[PDB]
Design a protein around this ligand. Structure first.
Ligand SMILES: Nc1ncnc2c1ncn2[C@@H]1O[C@H](C(=O)N2CCN(CC(=O)Nc3cccc4c3CNC4=O)CC2)[C@@H](O)[C@H]1O
Length: 340
């Protein structure tokens, strides 16, 4: 007895088929490790074979001091590689590659455990008010301008079809955000992820990567990363020609004074007076077209060449370092219409 597109959403984020599909594309042995035998008791433990492992990658531990450490990782998380010896986590892009797997397995466990514990019944245990914003409304027009308007010419392999668009109120997130409601420079920015992660995201909110996690992949370290150009967030949906429908969040992120870095720092504590970091993009929406909804700075002009050059990022990245600085306002269901 729920609205149609929300009933479809709840199925899409709790679909066990979509999880098992992700575990053989990650090359996990589903005979040696089903969804059931996954526990959080093995999660930080999997990071334990990464925190005390990457700590042996930058000197190169030598299989006197690696083989054993790489060995105990396959005691908790087995992997099947056809008829070839198991990849050794001694090189650069392996201990990191396996870190993106857990980031998923983490919320892959959250999804199943919420689905197994206790479709209205599963919605109940997202502790979140999901309403349908209707196509024709202004509500639904400003969201669409933004999606149409802040598409990138680098990120144009696919066109961006907007299916149906929701309005999200997570339990507690209001109270939690109250402090930062009063902080200047609040922007409704984009945050895309794997559909499987949205079990976790809606139940727990956006979390900062745990401390055990591998160093890099985090350009500015362990924060909650946003962007103004939809395509760039759209990208972390990792939606494929196989399943072309993705989910992307709009959020209110209270940024106050942004620490404006044109270059990667593993920021491990902001420099007192700064409440966010802003990676400075080359491209940016005309800061003239930047609309205001409720004291929030909806940045939805189009790509202008802000000749800011001493930089690495083609488009801006917004990072906060406190989970309380975010207040998720919508969840977007959009189709990736690909072109090769
Ligand atoms: N409750 C939670 N518990 C664990 N992981 C959670 C979580 N809520 C979200 N996550 C998910 O974990 C992942 C994570 O933190 N990551 C992976 C991505 N990585 C780099 C990063 O943030 N880059 C980056 C940069 C710019 C925009 C965007 C991103 C990611 N998404 C975007 O829209 C930072 C660490 C991510 O996929 C997120 O969606």
């Amino acid at each position: 007895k729920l609205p149609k597109p929300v009933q479809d959403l709840i199925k899409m984020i709790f679909d066990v088929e979509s999880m098992k599909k992700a575990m053989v594309e990650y090359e996990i042995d589903l005979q040696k490790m089903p969804l059931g035998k996954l526990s959080k008791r093995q999660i930080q433990a999997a990071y334990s074979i990464l925190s005390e492992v990457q700590q042996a990658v930058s000197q190169g531990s030598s299989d006197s001091q690696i083989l054993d450490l790489s060995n105990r990782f396959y005691t908790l998380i087995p992997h099947d590689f056809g008829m070839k010896k198991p990849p050794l986590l001694n090189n650069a892009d392996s201990v990191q590659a396996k870190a993106e797997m857990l980031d998923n397995l983490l919320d892959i466990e959250v999804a199943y455990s919420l689905l197994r514990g206790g479709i209205d019944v599963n919605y109940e245990k997202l502790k979140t008010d999901i309403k349908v914003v209707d196509r024709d409304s202004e509500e639904a027009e400003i969201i669409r301008k933004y999606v149409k308007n802040t598409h990138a010419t680098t990120h144009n392999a696919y066109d961006l079809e907007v299916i149906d668009i929701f309005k999200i109120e997570r339990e507690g997130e209001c109270q939690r955000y109250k402090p930062f409601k009063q902080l200047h420079n609040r922007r409704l920015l984009w945050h895309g992820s794997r559909t499987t992660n949205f079990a976790g995201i809606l139940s727990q909110g956006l979390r900062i990567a745990p401390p055990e996690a591998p160093v890099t992949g985090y350009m500015f370290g362990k924060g909650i990363y946003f962007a103004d150009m939809v395509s760039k967030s759209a990208n972390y949906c990792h939606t494929s020609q196989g399943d072309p429908i993705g989910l992307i969040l709009l959020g209110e992120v209270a940024l106050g004074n942004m620490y404006e870095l044109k270059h990667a720092s593993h920021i491990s504590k902001l420099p007192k007076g700064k409440h966010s970091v802003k990676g400075l993009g080359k491209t940016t929406p005309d800061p003239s077209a930047n609309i205001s909804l409720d004291g929030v700075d909806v940045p939805l002009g189009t790509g202008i060449s802000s000749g800011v050059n001493d930089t690495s990022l083609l488009y801006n990245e917004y990072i906060v370092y406190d989970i309380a600085q975010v207040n998720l306002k919508y969840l977007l269901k959009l189709k990736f219409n690909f072109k090769t």
